[PDB]
Design an enzyme around this catalytic site. Structure first.
Site, PDB file in Angstrom:
ATOM      1  N   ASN A   1     -46.271 -62.634 -33.713  1.00 56.27           N
ATOM      2  CA  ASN A   1     -46.482 -63.192 -35.041  1.00 56.27           C
ATOM      3  C   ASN A   1     -47.658 -62.504 -35.736  1.00 56.27           C
ATOM      4  OD1 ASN A   1     -48.901 -65.080 -35.704  1.00 56.27           O
ATOM      5  ND2 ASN A   1     -48.358 -65.703 -33.624  1.00 56.27           N
TER       6      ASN A   1
ATOM      7  N   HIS B   1     -48.428 -72.444 -22.308  1.00 56.24           N
ATOM      8  CA  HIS B   1     -47.162 -72.444 -23.009  1.00 56.24           C
ATOM      9  C   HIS B   1     -45.995 -71.986 -22.121  1.00 56.24           C
ATOM     10  CE1 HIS B   1     -46.503 -68.108 -24.448  1.00 56.24           C
ATOM     11  NE2 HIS B   1     -47.800 -68.022 -24.217  1.00 56.24           N
TER      12      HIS B   1
ATOM     13  N   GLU C   1     -46.076 -71.440 -28.777  1.00 54.29           N
ATOM     14  CA  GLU C   1     -47.381 -70.810 -28.784  1.00 54.29           C
ATOM     15  C   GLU C   1     -47.249 -69.468 -29.498  1.00 54.29           C
ATOM     16  OE1 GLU C   1     -48.413 -67.771 -27.358  1.00 54.29           O
ATOM     17  OE2 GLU C   1     -50.616 -68.039 -27.377  1.00 54.29           O
TER      18      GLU C   1
ATOM     19  N   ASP D   1     -52.197 -69.694 -19.548  1.00 55.43           N
ATOM     20  CA  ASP D   1     -51.231 -68.694 -19.930  1.00 55.43           C
ATOM     21  C   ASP D   1     -51.219 -67.650 -18.767  1.00 55.43           C
ATOM     22  OD1 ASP D   1     -49.334 -67.359 -21.406  1.00 55.43           O
ATOM     23  OD2 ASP D   1     -50.501 -66.892 -23.169  1.00 55.43           O
TER      24      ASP D   1
ATOM     25  N   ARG E   1     -60.804 -70.815 -19.361  1.00 56.45           N
ATOM     26  CA  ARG E   1     -59.578 -70.153 -18.965  1.00 56.45           C
ATOM     27  C   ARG E   1     -59.988 -69.087 -17.951  1.00 56.45           C
ATOM     28  NH1 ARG E   1     -57.584 -66.231 -24.006  1.00 56.45           N
ATOM     29  NH2 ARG E   1     -55.655 -66.388 -22.757  1.00 56.45           N
TER      30      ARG E   1
ATOM     31  N   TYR F   1     -46.523 -55.627 -22.794  1.00 56.25           N
ATOM     32  CA  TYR F   1     -46.740 -56.864 -23.536  1.00 56.25           C
ATOM     33  C   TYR F   1     -45.752 -57.150 -24.686  1.00 56.25           C
ATOM     34  CZ  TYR F   1     -49.685 -59.858 -26.670  1.00 56.25           C
ATOM     35  OH  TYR F   1     -50.156 -60.812 -27.550  1.00 56.25           O
ATOM     36  N   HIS F   2     -45.058 -58.287 -24.605  1.00 61.69           N
ATOM     37  CA  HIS F   2     -44.123 -58.718 -25.660  1.00 61.69           C
ATOM     38  C   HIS F   2     -42.878 -57.828 -25.845  1.00 61.69           C
ATOM     39  CE1 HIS F   2     -47.141 -61.523 -28.067  1.00 61.69           C
ATOM     40  NE2 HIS F   2     -46.909 -61.932 -26.826  1.00 61.69           N
TER      41      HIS F   2
ATOM     42  N   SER G   1     -86.044 -67.322 -43.281  1.00 64.86           N
ATOM     43  CA  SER G   1     -86.707 -67.628 -42.012  1.00 64.86           C
ATOM     44  C   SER G   1     -85.703 -68.149 -40.991  1.00 64.86           C
ATOM     45  CB  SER G   1     -87.799 -68.682 -42.216  1.00 64.86           C
ATOM     46  OG  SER G   1     -88.357 -69.066 -40.949  1.00 64.86           O
TER      47      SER G   1
ATOM     48  N   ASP H   1     -70.784 -89.809 -20.399  1.00 68.63           N
ATOM     49  CA  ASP H   1     -70.442 -89.778 -21.854  1.00 68.63           C
ATOM     50  C   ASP H   1     -71.326 -88.783 -22.605  1.00 68.63           C
ATOM     51  OD1 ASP H   1     -68.355 -91.508 -21.544  1.00 68.63           O
ATOM     52  OD2 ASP H   1     -69.280 -93.213 -22.605  1.00 68.63           O
TER      53      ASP H   1
ATOM     54  N   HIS I   1     -66.482 -75.748 -34.926  1.00 69.84           N
ATOM     55  CA  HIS I   1     -67.543 -75.584 -33.922  1.00 69.84           C
ATOM     56  C   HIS I   1     -68.584 -74.674 -34.579  1.00 69.84           C
ATOM     57  CE1 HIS I   1     -69.498 -74.960 -30.020  1.00 69.84           C
ATOM     58  NE2 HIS I   1     -68.569 -75.715 -29.436  1.00 69.84           N
TER      59      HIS I   1
HETATM   60  O1  LIG Z   1     -50.922 -66.895 -32.770  1.00 69.08           O
HETATM   61  C1  LIG Z   1     -51.899 -66.779 -31.994  1.00 69.08           C
HETATM   62  O2  LIG Z   1     -53.084 -67.135 -32.250  1.00 69.08           O
HETATM   63  C2  LIG Z   1     -51.635 -66.096 -30.607  1.00 69.08           C
HETATM   64  C3  LIG Z   1     -50.121 -66.025 -30.194  1.00 69.08           C
HETATM   65  C4  LIG Z   1     -49.966 -64.949 -28.991  1.00 69.08           C
HETATM   66  N1  LIG Z   1     -50.783 -65.380 -27.804  1.00 69.08           N
HETATM   67  P1  LIG Z   1     -50.391 -64.625 -26.337  1.00 69.08           P
HETATM   68  O3  LIG Z   1     -49.615 -63.365 -26.694  1.00 69.08           O
HETATM   69  O4  LIG Z   1     -49.473 -65.611 -25.586  1.00 69.08           O
HETATM   70  O5  LIG Z   1     -51.744 -64.209 -25.672  1.00 69.08           O
HETATM   71  C5  LIG Z   1     -52.687 -63.130 -26.441  1.00 69.08           C
HETATM   72  C6  LIG Z   1     -53.265 -61.858 -25.614  1.00 69.08           C
HETATM   73  C7  LIG Z   1     -54.406 -61.082 -25.954  1.00 69.08           C
HETATM   74  C8  LIG Z   1     -54.888 -60.016 -25.124  1.00 69.08           C
HETATM   75  C9  LIG Z   1     -54.211 -59.689 -23.926  1.00 69.08           C
HETATM   76  C10 LIG Z   1     -54.571 -58.689 -22.982  1.00 69.08           C
HETATM   77  C11 LIG Z   1     -53.752 -58.448 -21.882  1.00 69.08           C
HETATM   78  C12 LIG Z   1     -54.050 -57.466 -20.910  1.00 69.08           C
HETATM   79  C13 LIG Z   1     -55.238 -56.732 -20.977  1.00 69.08           C
HETATM   80  C14 LIG Z   1     -56.085 -56.980 -22.063  1.00 69.08           C
HETATM   81  C15 LIG Z   1     -55.750 -57.941 -23.037  1.00 69.08           C
HETATM   82  C16 LIG Z   1     -53.098 -60.479 -23.605  1.00 69.08           C
HETATM   83  C17 LIG Z   1     -52.651 -61.543 -24.404  1.00 69.08           C
HETATM   84  C18 LIG Z   1     -50.256 -63.556 -29.560  1.00 69.08           C
HETATM   85  O6  LIG Z   1     -51.419 -63.041 -29.397  1.00 69.08           O
HETATM   86  O7  LIG Z   1     -49.291 -63.033 -30.229  1.00 69.08           O
HETATM   87 CL   LIG Z   2     -55.251 -68.517 -20.018  1.00 70.39          CL
HETATM   88 ZN   LIG Z   3     -48.884 -66.293 -23.996  1.00 71.33          ZN
HETATM   89 ZN   LIG Z   4     -47.747 -63.625 -26.040  1.00 66.35          ZN
END
Ligand SMILES: O=C(O)CC[C@H](NP(=O)(O)OCc1ccc(-c2ccccc2)cc1)C(=O)O
Ligand SMILES: [Cl-]
Ligand SMILES: [Zn+2]
Ligand SMILES: [Zn+2]
Ligand SMILES: *[C@@H]1O[C@H](CO)[C@@H](O[C@@H]2O[C@H](CO)[C@@H](O[C@@H]3O[C@H](CO)[C@@H](O)[C@H](O[C@H]4O[C@H](CO)[C@@H](O)[C@H](O)[C@@H]4O)[C@@H]3O)[C@H](O)[C@H]2NC(C)=O)[C@H](O)[C@H]1NC(C)=O
Ligand SMILES: *[C@@H]1O[C@H](CO)[C@@H](O[C@@H]2O[C@H](CO)[C@@H](O[C@@H]3O[C@H](CO)[C@@H](O)[C@H](O[C@H]4O[C@H](CO)[C@@H](O)[C@H](O)[C@@H]4O)[C@@H]3O)[C@H](O)[C@H]2NC(C)=O)[C@H](O)[C@H]1NC(C)=O
Ligand SMILES: *[C@@H]1O[C@H](CO)[C@@H](O[C@@H]2O[C@H](CO)[C@@H](O[C@@H]3O[C@H](CO)[C@@H](O)[C@H](O)[C@@H]3O)[C@H](O)[C@H]2NC(C)=O)[C@H](O)[C@H]1NC(C)=O
Ligand SMILES: *[C@@H]1O[C@H](CO)[C@@H](O[C@@H]2O[C@H](CO)[C@@H](O[C@@H]3O[C@H](CO)[C@@H](O)[C@H](O)[C@@H]3O)[C@H](O)[C@H]2NC(C)=O)[C@H](O)[C@H]1NC(C)=O
Ligand SMILES: *[C@@H]1O[C@H](CO)[C@@H](O[C@@H]2O[C@H](CO)[C@@H](O)[C@H](O)[C@H]2NC(C)=O)[C@H](O)[C@H]1NC(C)=O
Ligand SMILES: *[C@@H]1O[C@H](CO)[C@@H](O[C@@H]2O[C@H](CO)[C@@H](O)[C@H](O)[C@H]2NC(C)=O)[C@H](O)[C@H]1NC(C)=O
Ligand SMILES: *[C@@H]1O[C@H](CO)[C@@H](O[C@@H]2O[C@H](CO)[C@@H](O)[C@H](O)[C@H]2NC(C)=O)[C@H](O)[C@H]1NC(C)=O
Ligand SMILES: *[C@@H]1O[C@H](CO)[C@@H](O[C@@H]2O[C@H](CO)[C@@H](O)[C@H](O)[C@H]2NC(C)=O)[C@H](O)[C@H]1NC(C)=O
Ligand SMILES: *[C@@H]1O[C@H](CO)[C@@H](O[C@@H]2O[C@H](CO)[C@@H](O)[C@H](O)[C@H]2NC(C)=O)[C@H](O)[C@H]1NC(C)=O
Ligand SMILES: *[C@@H]1O[C@H](CO)[C@@H](O[C@@H]2O[C@H](CO)[C@@H](O)[C@H](O)[C@H]2NC(C)=O)[C@H](O)[C@H]1NC(C)=O
Ligand SMILES: O=C(O)CC[C@H](NP(=O)(O)OCc1ccc(-c2ccccc2)cc1)C(=O)O
Ligand SMILES: *[C@@H]1O[C@H](CO)[C@@H](O)[C@H](O)[C@H]1NC(C)=O
Ligand SMILES: *[C@@H]1O[C@H](CO)[C@@H](O)[C@H](O)[C@H]1NC(C)=O
Ligand SMILES: *[C@@H]1O[C@H](CO)[C@@H](O)[C@H](O)[C@H]1NC(C)=O
Ligand SMILES: *[C@@H]1O[C@H](CO)[C@@H](O)[C@H](O)[C@H]1NC(C)=O
Ligand SMILES: [Ca+2]
Ligand SMILES: [Ca+2]
Ligand SMILES: [Cl-]
Ligand SMILES: [Zn+2]
Ligand SMILES: [Zn+2]
Lengths: 694, 694
Positions: free
Chosen positions: A203, A323, A370, A399, A480, A498-499, A574, A610, A633
């Site tokens: 996304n 997720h 997610e 994750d 995490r 990835y993906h 300051s 608490d 935050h």
């Molecule tokens: O919409 C949103 O905020 C997030 C939705 C989604 N979260 P995801 O793909 O399930 O996890 C993000 C991610 C970020 C960095 C790495 C990584 C892996 C190996 C080595 C170094 C870095 C792996 C995953 C995304 O990012 O598209």
């Molecule tokens: Cl995680």
């Molecule tokens: Zn993921």
């Molecule tokens: Zn992902």
């Protein structure tokens, strides 16, 4: 005996392997029937495993899908309007899967429809600093151009935001071998590298913690009032599409105009990496044309929520969530995480069947959607925010367990540092060459802290995963942990596959973790943390660790401001109030720690528990950060330039960022001072939650 | 025995009398040295009385004062520019005070400076409906006119807001005998009526719960970043000044133009009450000229904060608070309240010296600068919002004890209804003709509930007093009780001598409460409520009372919407979700009540006490109401037309208000539906806080 050791010994690598296999045979795309059936399976098994209650929580959220009968692609088009090159319509499927149905073709979720046609500008990683370099130093104007950017370094949604603000009329994202092809390793199916036809889905929203684009603030339930699309949160205004490096080479090889400014702009393809605009002499009349026909559609999603009721403090919740939806098979992301959660539930359940219960309630979550913007976790947290606010002890994410197989990678609140150090000292390292050594030892050796000898690095929470609503919006202590490749060289880009369709069970079993020992180590870290948070009489948080980092972050933001000493003199900027607040926090935290060590009295205990639980909560400002009302935050926020990265004192950081470019320095420096005041006040207010209560 | 009866018997009418005398010999205007010395005296005495800790909490807030050497006044000016009539520069001082220094002359606090000159338009009470009548029915245009309005019916800040939006260039406020002179009673010093030279002071801000205009969100401490005046919250844009009815008659008697539309526009003066614009024939060349030279100045204010630490739950706070600053002597407002607080502290302190402590912590507050916009309470609540959020059980206000001497007047959350009924059944009525009867009996007879036989009326909380930040912003269960004149005929206008120099100790001692028995009854109601809230094992809140009113309010808002059945059909406006939420709330509340009656287990108790305490908190929406971010309660808010009045389902009410006038009905009805969704969701979310926790 039912203790943490009985819990940990019951976890088995072979169970995690069996569950991963089970979760990765077919795609589980959010909003599809196969992901709903998997939700029902997990619900059934968590009940079998012994949880007190397991329910589906469903929501109707905006998702995005390609049009099955009108495929997305990109062309080079000649003078006459003939399309002389087309990008691929799908990734060639891996061996034995060439007949699997319902593999979503690569696309950028939430892209608008369009067919824009124009000249290319190459923008490196499309980072804030890359657009600065182009517009300010090179005098290249992206307005009305199609930008092509390589994936990596920052969240792809930030790239699209940056391109949009530069005036681009479309964005092409691609995976460069420099970032997704490790030297001397083979392409899938023969190794873990990205082939030329592989493509990263994902996304490209900029939600800033809003959750479903149509219902910010409120759960997307059956009667929810939805914004119109034109008022939706975070949607890109220009078409976007991802391609692999075979296709990228065809688009880049003809590029002309200006040379790249330096070698940090050149990837690994055999092309000049010219910035453009447009192609060299002979091809100057050719253009690039995008064809995007994806649609956004309100679709039902399903979270699985499992409860293990606490024996003593059932109104105190420790949450383990991760997720279940994936882009395709989700061999690593998320099923290597979800299989670990599954074995953790099974283990807690074995103890429960023998008569044990945790002291506090444990909630287990399998989040949906997610991948489309943390939608499932965020809607559920919006629905339950009052319970979470007043009862939420901690959130542990779950994750991908194995980003890599080199060492542990932890990001968490300072309140969990001691807990993580203590726990990893009691776990065995799975690493080659560290047999009979602790996980703490191998982790500290491979990922040393930059500020302390003999400690490991622990990083800050930003976003890009399901802890975001719990930590940044609600102020629940969060953490995490996962195994990774190499924090030093790749923090934010993803592993090569990835993906992509190639991220499969076989990828994991052959090339990442054949014995499932890294998965098991991660199960022990995540499960052990949940066990201690849910069972320790005194919550396992050390407020003194917050005092130490608050000082580091104050020193850091002060040094940033001190690049502008004349303006600090002129506008009387300051940092004294912030240092004073941090000093007070340090003093009060130390006294609280003494009392915590120095008290049979359950009211004093729970009063003290608490104070520990509400300490993270005290860093929440109910007005939120400027123009980001769901990031509340004050110490941490996802970086405004890269959602994946955590930033400290974000309000002050953003007020100082690129401040020398602001046209009204008086106004800009006034806002820096306002943010210093908010930060000092919030730190002192949090400190005061730890004072004697009366 | 130390029980509520020992506490109540220790309260003495003669002590309250002595304290009132002590607090009313000199003016105690906010930000002045005499109010700082009174703060120090109260601090010293509360320590003597036996409180564990008593501190001053100070803030530097925007206040407003007349210029001592350039007095404010109004003229009628002739053609040549001669000022032929001037309003008074001060109220003639009462007998024996003609030499008292530092009596602030009448003025409207926070008026900007100016000298506008123009024709008068008379706008009745300057209510929303009065401007509708003028602009829509009578076709009178206030643009560029000086508006003259009688005080009464609504908060004077709303009058000024309404005049500003109508385009007025200044506002003259006056006290009409119709509203401030009761038939057959003598003027001060010979009775309790307003003389012709008496004038009502008061602020004309529209803060909407912001507190200090310069620091919304954050306490106005030593390092606070302040908005510039032009960005300040709630300041009027046109000059405003108050006058008495001798001066008003001189301004009204010449008025020409249109007749008043009907008798509800005519007061009691011997004038036509012509609306204008301008004067009749002979005087048509004369104009009214204002001269306002007041200045806004950041000034230090001081709250006194007293703590009586709880024996068992010191991290649970029951707050008794009321203001100490007055316009002049404050004989009624606030010192008749502050003297009651003082005797309450003294009584709790007597028990403490005998070895008793309340179960929960009691905080006592003497607030400063209430009269300038609830500034002291609001800044302190902003400073301590995290402690209040997580530990605040209840807030009991304590301003004027004796608005009148006819019967009790209570406004509180539904959560306190049962507590108030039970307590008043155990107290003696002080009323003539009810000797030996309970306070409940006399109160119920004189102020019957409109919906239930044999119950008294209890009204809704809006604003106009220091409970506002605790209830509307923070969602802490709040209540107030005082003796009053006549709810039926005068809810919002004030007693005749309100905010005038004539509101003295003698006024009270001669004409309101010579035996101080009404003051004593109010001390017993306020003190008794605090006692029960701080000492009862189970918090004395009945969630079922909320379920009953939620249904009433849902029926009410639905009936308002049903004045537009065609639009409800066209835009599919359904209230089904809200009724469903209210039904669920009713069912869940009933089950919770059974559990509460049906459980030795302190964790279950405190878990249940936490569910009771956080129930009011569950009605808070962290996004606030539309354009009013500091009004966060979804069931109640101060009316947008009259800050003094509480409104129920305010988000829906405001979305429906005057909806037939909106130019885009589709948009307007969309917003009604959005507010229905927010209300249904928040009611269901609050209900779910009372479900079993796991
Ligand atoms: O919409 C949103 O905020 C997030 C939705 C989604 N979260 P995801 O793909 O399930 O996890 C993000 C991610 C970020 C960095 C790495 C990584 C892996 C190996 C080595 C170094 C870095 C792996 C995953 C995304 O990012 O598209
Ligand atoms: Cl995680
Ligand atoms: Zn993921
Ligand atoms: Zn992902
Ligand atoms: C960290 O904790 C410390 C407490 O240990 C806390 O110290 C407080 O600092 C404030 C602000 O500096 C002090 O405020 C002063 O209070 C006195 C009355 O007690 C006032 O008279 C002072 O005002 C005068 O002086 C000012 C400063 O020059 C002038 O501007 C002003 O016009 C007055 O002339 C001033 O308000 C406060 O007393 C202490 N409290 C202590 C020592 O107990 C500190 O604020 C904390 N840090 C943060 C960021 O909160
Ligand atoms: C008050 O409390 C009650 C619980 O006692 C609660 O009832 C819930 O209402 C929702 C919304 O009406 C129900 O939602 C349904 O859930 C099923 C799955 O369990 C879905 O299949 C349904 O969706 C189908 O039907 C819809 C309606 O026509 C279609 O629009 C949709 O496309 C699907 O075809 C639907 O989501 C829920 O099951 C109950 N829960 C119960 C009975 O336990 C009610 O919501 C509460 N009121 C408020 C205001 O919260
Ligand atoms: C992580 O492990 C460390 C090391 O075991 C934990 O710190 C230790 O915690 C214990 C228990 O509170 C401390 O013992 C206390 O000692 C004092 C005397 O100094 C005494 O007054 C108490 O009654 C108690 O015996 C011990 O000092 C402390 N050791 C340290 C800081 O080196 C730490 O709590 C663990 N972190 C967690 C659980 O989050
Ligand atoms: C205001 O006063 C009323 C009347 O005294 C209080 O209601 C009463 O509260 C008591 C204590 O919980 C109830 O007694 C219970 O009765 C049931 C059997 O029906 C039993 O299961 C319990 O163990 C207990 O004995 C009593 O029924 C109830 N009476 C009513 C509702 O008429 C009320 O609580 C007071 N309100 C407060 C304190 O806020
Ligand atoms: C994943 O595991 C589940 C649970 O064992 C399998 O679902 C079961 O399949 C059997 C045989 O078809 C049915 O009789 C059960 O009702 C199912 N149990 C459930 C859904 O809880 C599922 O077949 C496995 N999936 C894959 C792809 O291996
Ligand atoms: C996806 O693309 C298809 C195929 O082009 C679209 O189906 C066409 O829609 C138009 C009207 O919108 C019809 O007149 C055509 O006959 C359809 N063509 C075919 C081949 O079916 C469809 O609109 C798109 N789906 C979406 C937008 O969700
Ligand atoms: C790239 O794809 C396009 C779309 O399928 C191809 O162009 C089409 O070719 C058909 C028949 O050859 C024509 O009847 C269509 O009108 C064309 N469509 C468009 C939009 O131009 C094109 O041939 C492909 N290019 C290459 C090199 O394969
Ligand atoms: C109000 O009462 C207070 C408290 O009794 C009086 O202040 C005391 O006055 C005496 C005599 O002047 C001093 O010795 C004490 O130090 C004061 N005590 C304090 C300030 O706590 C005060 O005089 C009375 N005020 C009026 C107007 O009657
Ligand atoms: C209040 O009004 C006085 C009196 O008119 C103001 O004092 C004058 O201020 C001006 C400059 O601002 C001087 O030149 C005059 O000499 C002053 N006159 C007198 C008689 O003192 C004063 O400015 C005002 N106070 C405020 C605005 O706070
Ligand atoms: C109302 O007050 C004004 C201001 O004091 C009076 O007008 C002033 O009169 C003096 C001397 O008589 C002149 O020198 C000033 O120039 C006047 N000032 C202004 C602003 O006009 C006026 O006389 C008073 N009117 C009545 C009826 O008493
Ligand atoms: O700024 C703000 O919000 C409020 C600041 C200030 N609160 P207060 O004058 O101390 O109390 C308001 C009040 C309202 C109504 C009545 C009354 C009395 C007798 C009979 C009937 C009604 C008495 C008082 C004010 O309103 O100016
Ligand atoms: C970029 O190009 C467009 C003209 O097509 C123009 O509107 C815009 O101002 C240009 N920006 C710069 C910085 O030159
Ligand atoms: C996993 O570890 C093995 C053996 O140490 C190594 O050869 C392999 O490259 C690693 N896999 C990945 C994806 O890094
Ligand atoms: C009121 O008067 C002014 C002209 O002085 C004008 O601008 C405004 O539009 C008028 N409003 C109406 C409703 O006539
Ligand atoms: C107080 O009560 C007395 C005697 O009942 C009555 O005469 C008087 O008018 C009352 N005072 C006020 C201010 O109502
Ligand atoms: Ca939502
Ligand atoms: Ca403030
Ligand atoms: Cl009150
Ligand atoms: Zn008052
Ligand atoms: Zn008042």
């Amino acid at each position: 005996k039912h203790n943490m050791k009985a819990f940990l010994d019951e976890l088995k690598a072979e169970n995690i392997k069996k569950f991963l296999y089970n979760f990765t045979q077919i795609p589980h795309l959010a909003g599809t029937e196969q992901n709903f059936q998997l939700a029902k399976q997990i619900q059934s098994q968590w009940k079998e495993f012994g949880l007190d209650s397991v329910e589906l929580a469903h929501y109707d959220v905006l998702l995005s899908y390609p049009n099955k009968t009108h495929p997305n692609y990109i062309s080079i088009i000649n003078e006459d309007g003939n399309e002389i090159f087309n990008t691929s319509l799908f990734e060639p499927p891996p061996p034995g899967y060439e007949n699997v149905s319902d593999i979503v073709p690569p696309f950028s979720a939430f892209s608008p429809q369009g067919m824009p046609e124009g000249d290319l500008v190459y923008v490196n990683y499309a980072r804030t600093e890359d657009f600065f370099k182009l517009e300010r130093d090179m005098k290249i104007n992206c307005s009305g151009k199609i930008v092509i950017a390589r994936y990596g370094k920052v969240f792809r949604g930030n790239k699209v935001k940056n391109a949009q603000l530069a005036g681009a009329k479309g964005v092409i994202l691609y995976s460069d071998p420099a970032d997704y092809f490790a030297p001397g390793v083979k392409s899938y199916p023969d190794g873990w590298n990205l082939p030329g036809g592989g493509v990263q889905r994902g996304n490209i929203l900029n939600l800033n913690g809003a959750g479903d684009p149509l219902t910010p603030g409120y759960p997307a339930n059956e009667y929810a009032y939805r914004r119109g699309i034109a008022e939706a949160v975070g949607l890109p205004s220009i078409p976007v599409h991802p391609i692999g490096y075979y296709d990228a080479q065809k688009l880049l090889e003809k590029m002309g105009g200006s040379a790249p400014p330096d070698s940090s702009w050149r990837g690994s393809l055999k092309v000049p990496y010219n910035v453009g605009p447009g192609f060299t002499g002979n091809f100057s009349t050719q253009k690039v044309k995008m064809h995007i026909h994806s649609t956004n559609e309100v679709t039902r999603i399903y979270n699985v929520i499992g409860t293990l009721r606490g024996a003593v403090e059932p109104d105190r919740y420790v949450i383990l969530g991760g997720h279940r939806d994936s882009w395709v098979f989700g061999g690593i992301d998320p099923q290597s995480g979800a299989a670990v959660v599954h074995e953790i539930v099974r283990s807690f359940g074995t103890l429960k069947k023998e008569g044990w219960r945790p002291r506090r309630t444990i909630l287990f979550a399998s989040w949906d959607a997610e991948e489309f913007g943390l939608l499932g976790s965020t809607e559920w947290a919006e629905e339950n925010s009052r319970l979470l606010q007043e009862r939420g002890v901690a959130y542990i994410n779950a994750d991908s367990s194995i980003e890599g197989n080199y060492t542990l990678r932890v990001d968490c609140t300072p309140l969990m540092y001691s807990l993580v150090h203590n726990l990893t000292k009691e776990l065995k390292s799975p690493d080659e060459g560290f047999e009979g050594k602790s996980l703490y030892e191998s982790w500290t050796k491979k990922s040393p802290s930059p500020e302390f000898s003999g400690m490991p690095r622990i990083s800050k929470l930003g976003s890009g995963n399901d802890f975001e609503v719990f930590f940044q919006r609600l102020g629940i202590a969060s953490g995490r942990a996962r195994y990774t490749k190499n924090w030093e060289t790749n923090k934010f880009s993803g592993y090569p596959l990835y993906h992509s369709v190639y991220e499969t069970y076989e990828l994991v079993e052959k090339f990442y973790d054949p014995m499932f020992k890294y998965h098991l180590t991660v199960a022990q870290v995540r499960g052990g943390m949940v066990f201690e948070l849910a069972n320790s009489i005194v919550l396992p948080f050390d407020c003194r660790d917050y005092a130490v980092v608050l000082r580091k972050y104050a020193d850091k933001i002060y040094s940033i401001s001190m690049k502008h000493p004349q303006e600090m003199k002129t506008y009387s900027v300051s940092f004294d109030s912030l240092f004073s607040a941090v000093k007070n926090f340090t003093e009060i935290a130390s006294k609280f720690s003494e009392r915590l060590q120095d008290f049979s009295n359950p009211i004093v205990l729970r009063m003290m528990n608490d104070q520990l639980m509400f300490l993270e909560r005290a860093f929440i400002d109910p007005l939120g950060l400027p123009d980001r009302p769901f990031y509340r935050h004050v110490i941490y926020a996802p970086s405004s330039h890269n959602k994946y990265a955590g930033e400290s004192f974000p309000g002050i950081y953003d007020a100082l960022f690129d401040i020398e470019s602001k046209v009204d320095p008086s106004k800009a420096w006034g806002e820096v001072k306002r943010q210093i005041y908010v930060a000092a006040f919030t730190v002192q207010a949090a400190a005061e939650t730890l004072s004697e209560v009366a």
